[PDB]
Structure formats: C-alpha cells, structure tokens
Write an enzyme that holds these catalytic residues in place. Structure first.
Site, mmCIF file in Angstrom:
data_model
loop_
_atom_site.group_PDB
_atom_site.id
_atom_site.type_symbol
_atom_site.label_atom_id
_atom_site.label_comp_id
_atom_site.label_asym_id
_atom_site.label_seq_id
_atom_site.Cartn_x
_atom_site.Cartn_y
_atom_site.Cartn_z
ATOM 1 N N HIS A 8 0.810 -1.209 0.000
ATOM 2 C CA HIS A 8 0.000 0.000 0.000
ATOM 3 C C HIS A 8 0.850 1.269 0.000
ATOM 4 C CE1 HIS A 8 0.988 0.909 4.142
ATOM 5 N NE2 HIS A 8 0.657 -0.318 4.501
ATOM 6 N N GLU A 74 -0.714 -6.562 7.993
ATOM 7 C CA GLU A 74 0.687 -6.516 8.376
ATOM 8 C C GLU A 74 0.760 -7.299 9.692
ATOM 9 O OE1 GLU A 74 3.906 -4.732 7.191
ATOM 10 O OE2 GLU A 74 3.949 -6.594 8.356
#
Lengths: 171, 170
Positions: A8, A74
């Site tokens: 991202h 994550e």
C-alpha cells in the site's frame, strides 16, 4: 500460481520511521499519488486486500474493488505498534532484520505471521492481485530467497511458491 | 518448492557408530563448529527443526530460530537406541538395509516414521530450511530416487517433491 502483491501507499509513519501494523492510519497525499500510478500497471485479475484503510484505499485508487481479508494484514506489533525504529531495542531490531524469533508483547510472533500469510496464499485457487503490507511482501520474498524490502506503492509478481517474476516500481 | 534438509552436527554416537534416534545427545565441539559453518551457506528461509537438542542447537548456531516439530525427529530405535551398528543383529541390520519394514522393540515402525515425516513435508506451505536427522534426510533423498550420503552438519536442497537441487557437504 501467478500472484501480484502490492504494498500500500505511504502513510505518515513511513517518513517518521514508526512501526505500523494493526494501527489504522490513512494514506498521505503522496500515498494516494502512488496508488493512482498503479492503475493500468497491474493485471486485471481478481483482487483481495487487507481490510486496513490504507490497503483498501490503494486498491480503490488502483482501479480495483477487492474482497477484504484480515489475513492480508501486516504483522501485529503489539506493544511495539507506533514505536520508532531508531529507538527499538537491538534484540527487536535484529529479530526483524534477520526475520526470525520476533515475539512482541501483546502482539503476533513472526512464526505465527508467516503461517497466517502462507496459509492464505495456499488457499488461492487462481491468479490474483493482493493489496497488502510491507511485511507480507517481505515474508513472501524472503521465503523465495530474495531481499524482501519494497517501496510503498510498489508491487511484485511471483510464481508462488517457486520464484519471483518481476518487481514493479513507478516514479 | 525449495526445501533444505539439514543434518544436525555430530554427537558422540556418530563417531562411536551407535544408533541415535530419540536419545537426546548434545553436540560435540566439532558438531557445534559444523553448525556454525552452516551460517554462511543456508538461505534465510522459514526454519523448522526437530525438537531434539542436537537439532535445535544446530539451528541456533547456524543463525536460525526454528519452529519446533517432533515430526522431524529421527526414527525411535526403542531398545536399539545406542546399539553399535557394527554388532547389530542381522535381523535388524537386514531390515534397516532392505527398507521394506522395521519395528524395533519399544520403538517406532518405519511405517509410523514415514507417515510422520511425509505428513509434515506435505503440510509445508512455503519454502523452508529443515534442521533434522540422517534418517529423515535419507527418506527425502530416497523418495527422489537418490542414495543418502549426507554427513553430519551437511545439507541437501530439494525441489520438493520433484528432484534434488544441490548437495552441500562442508
């Protein structure tokens, strides 16, 4: 299996050097800029994304409408969420650098993180584009025997679980 | 999928020529040196290891922090643990050499050993470095149509379950 993993776009903590895991921060202006540059640069395959706002927003600006999966998140840094890399205890720095034996209090161990990520990849039944995070891309790259550090808003295509096919960065 | 099968460093029973399975022997000084030498060769892939001390210590000295799995243990020789290979009864020696079946008293059968090892390998979801034992490495090599000449502290990389990629004997 051909899989495209996308990191991202950047958030403020990229420039600030703070660990960003399950903390939900938005993309910066440049982060949205990085995301827009991905449109037309990624294959038109089914898309999946971490449910974190920054990931979903990157997918959107990239021209995708992904299905959300928390499995693409994550690693959960636990008490280390938001901690400055600079002042991180040498033990934690080493664990993250060597990508092994990392178990933050209140968080997710690296081993657990890898199992989560690889279990998700194993379930994919066809080529797809995955909007995810730096640590997820790193886990995949390292498992394939390569340095797994990629710029925010960049992508890597791999033939999972055999080899890396291409690393894509846009200026 | 790339798998590195690493044989733990030597223990006293290796140089003494004794069957070593579930007996938890430590590495000798040379065994530790062999382990250290692996640090500059093994790829930084996810690591797994037999829970035996000699395997765990080899992983640590090679620079890894492995997930522990008893499925990676050598076969349990039962009453034959520590028995000299040179004076092993022909009944057992043949059995081990024929690779058709084996079940030592108080021990584990070859069938149970294989179910164990192969179930583990088939369950891996990404490339990995496996710190294990001679019998496990031999099982993998034989499944790929190859012998099994891998000394303590050495490794063999394979493209599972297709072929051997390379052998690393330091």
């Amino acid at each position: 299996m051909e899989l495209w993993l996308v990191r991202h776009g950047e958030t403020l903590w990229n420039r600030e050097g703070r660990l960003l895991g399950w903390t939900d921060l938005p993309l910066t202006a440049e982060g949205e800029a990085q995301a827009r540059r991905l449109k037309g640069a990624l294959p038109s395959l089914p898309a999946f994304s971490s449910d974190m706002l920054r990931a979903r927003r990157t997918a959107e600006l990239a021209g995708f409408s992904p299905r959300l999966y928390p499995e693409l998140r994550e690693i959960h840094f636990g008490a280390l969420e938001g901690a400055l890399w600079e002042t991180l205890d040498p033990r934690y720095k080493e664990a993250l650098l060597r990508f092994q034996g990392f178990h933050p209090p209140g968080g997710e161990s690296l081993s657990a993180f890898q199992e989560r990520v690889f279990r998700f990849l194993e379930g994919l039944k066809a080529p797809a584009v995955l909007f995810t995070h730096g640590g997820v891309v790193r886990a995949v790259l390292r498992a394939l025997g390569e340095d797994g550090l990629v710029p925010p808003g960049s992508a890597v295509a791999v033939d999972w679980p055999r080899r890396v096919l291409v690393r894509l960065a846009l200026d």
